[PDB]
Design a protein around this ligand. Sequence first.
Ligand SMILES: [Zn+2]
Ligand SMILES: [Zn+2]
Ligand SMILES: [Zn+2]
Ligand SMILES: [Zn+2]
Ligand SMILES: [Zn+2]
Ligand SMILES: [Zn+2]
Ligand SMILES: [Zn+2]
Ligand SMILES: [Zn+2]
Ligand SMILES: [Zn+2]
Lengths: 124, 123, 123, 123
Amino acid sequence: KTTYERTFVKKDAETKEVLEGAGFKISNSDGKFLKLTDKDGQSVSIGEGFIDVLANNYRLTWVAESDATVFTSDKSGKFGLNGFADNTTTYTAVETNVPDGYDAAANTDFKADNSSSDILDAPS
Amino acid sequence: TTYERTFVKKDAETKEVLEGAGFKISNSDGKFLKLTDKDGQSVSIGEGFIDVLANNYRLTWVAESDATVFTSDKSGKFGLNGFADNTTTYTAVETNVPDGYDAAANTDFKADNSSSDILDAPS
Amino acid sequence: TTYERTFVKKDAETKEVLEGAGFKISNSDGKFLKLTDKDGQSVSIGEGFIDVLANNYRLTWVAESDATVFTSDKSGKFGLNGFADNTTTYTAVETNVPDGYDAAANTDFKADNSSSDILDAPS
Amino acid sequence: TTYERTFVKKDAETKEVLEGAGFKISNSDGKFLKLTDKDGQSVSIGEGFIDVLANNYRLTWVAESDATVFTSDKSGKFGLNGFADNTTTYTAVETNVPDGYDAAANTDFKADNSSSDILDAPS
Ligand SMILES: [Zn+2]
Ligand SMILES: [Zn+2]
Ligand SMILES: [Zn+2]
Ligand SMILES: [Zn+2]
Ligand SMILES: [Zn+2]
Ligand SMILES: [Zn+2]
Ligand SMILES: [Zn+2]
Ligand SMILES: [Zn+2]
Ligand SMILES: [Zn+2]
C-alpha cells in the first residue's frame, strides 16, 4: 500500500551550516519509539542520512525508547526515512545524541507528510 | 509436566493475522519472562511459538529490560511451552507494535494450553 | 590477600538444589558488582562459583544495569573469590528467578570465606 | 583545532596508579560524553587515553545511560583529545569503582591540555 516519508536537515542555529552526526529518536504519543527491522524482524545497522526503508525492505515498529533506532544527520545534515504507514499522526523527533559544541535542539513535532524541514542546534 | 500458551495476533478490523508484533510476558511480581539455555545463557529466538521443551530451554523471571520478546510469525502466532504452573496469572504486554497499528490492550492469561486472539486496532 | 563467598540455592520446601537462579551483589552505596578482565573489559561468565583469582579478573562496583549476574549451577552453587574486604556488608539480590519459584529474600553477607543456603519458595 | 585532557587515577594512600577505574564525563546540561565513529555508531574503547583525532571519532553529548565509560589503564591514565571547547566546565564522575576503593569525589575540569591526578581512598 501507499506510504509516506519525512526528511530533516540539521543546522547550526547561528551560521545555518549543516551539521553531521546529530542523532535522533522518533516517538509517538504512546511514548514508544521507532525501530527499523529487516523482513525477518531482526535489528539492522543503519548509518547516517535518509534511510530508504522501501528499497531495503525494512519494517517500522514502535518500541521502548532503549530499543529504538537512532537516526543521524549525514554530511549534508540530512536524516529521515520513507515507509511510514500514516501521514496524519503526530510524531516527535528527539535529539538523543548531540554534537560536541552544540546544545540539543528543541523537540520537533512533525507528521510524515513527505516534506523536508530544518532542525537548529544552538552553539554552546 | 508443563503447560503451554499460544496467541494469534490479528488486525481488529479485518481479522487478518499480523506478523511482527512483539510481546513480553510479566508476572504479578513485576518480573518478565526470559528464556535461557541449560547453562543460563541468553538465546536468540525468532518469531512464532517457542518449543522450550524440545530445545531444553529454561524459563526465568527477570527485569523488564532483560526480558525475552516473543513475536507473531507469518500465521500471527506466538507463545511457548514449558510453563511450570497453570494456575498463575500472567500478562502479555505488546512492547513492539507493527507500524500502522495501535498496541493491543494487555492480555491477562494462564498457561492453560489454550490458544486465543489478540487484536491490534489499525491506526 | 582476598576473600570469597559461596551460596547454595535451594527449594525452600524440598531443599533440592536449584540451578539457574541469577543474582546481583550490591554494596551500601547502591552499586553492584561487575567482573572485568585485566583490561577492564566485560567477561561472559557461566553458572557457578567464579574463580576470579585463577582467571585474573577484577571486581568493580557499577550501576545495577551494568552489573554481573551470578547464577546457581547444577549443584545450586554460586559465588566468587577475590573480594578485597571481609568486613563490608553486601547483599545478594535475586534478579533472575527460576520459573515455578518466588524470589528469595535479599541475603545480607560478608565476604568471610563461608558458604550458606538461599531458599526459593515454590510459587 | 581541538583540546585534550588526561587524568591519572591513584591510590590516595600509596599514590600507586590504579587500573580499571571507570569514569563518565558530564557537561552542565546534565548530558554525558559519548564517542561515536564517523557514521554515528558506538565504538568499543579500552582503557587509557583515547586518541579521538587519530581514530576519526566524534564527541557527542547524550543521556547518562548511553555514555562512554573511560577507564584508567596500567599507568592509571585515561582521557581523550578532540574536545571542541577549552573554556567549558566538565565533570569526571567515577561510575565504576575498583574493589577495595571508595569512589573519588567528582572532578571538575576544562579541556585545557593538562594532566592531573584523581585519588581513590582505600575502603
Ligand atoms: Zn496511538
Ligand atoms: Zn490485566
Ligand atoms: Zn488509533
Ligand atoms: Zn529433582
Ligand atoms: Zn552447572
Ligand atoms: Zn560504523
Ligand atoms: Zn562507600
Ligand atoms: Zn562542582
Ligand atoms: Zn601525581
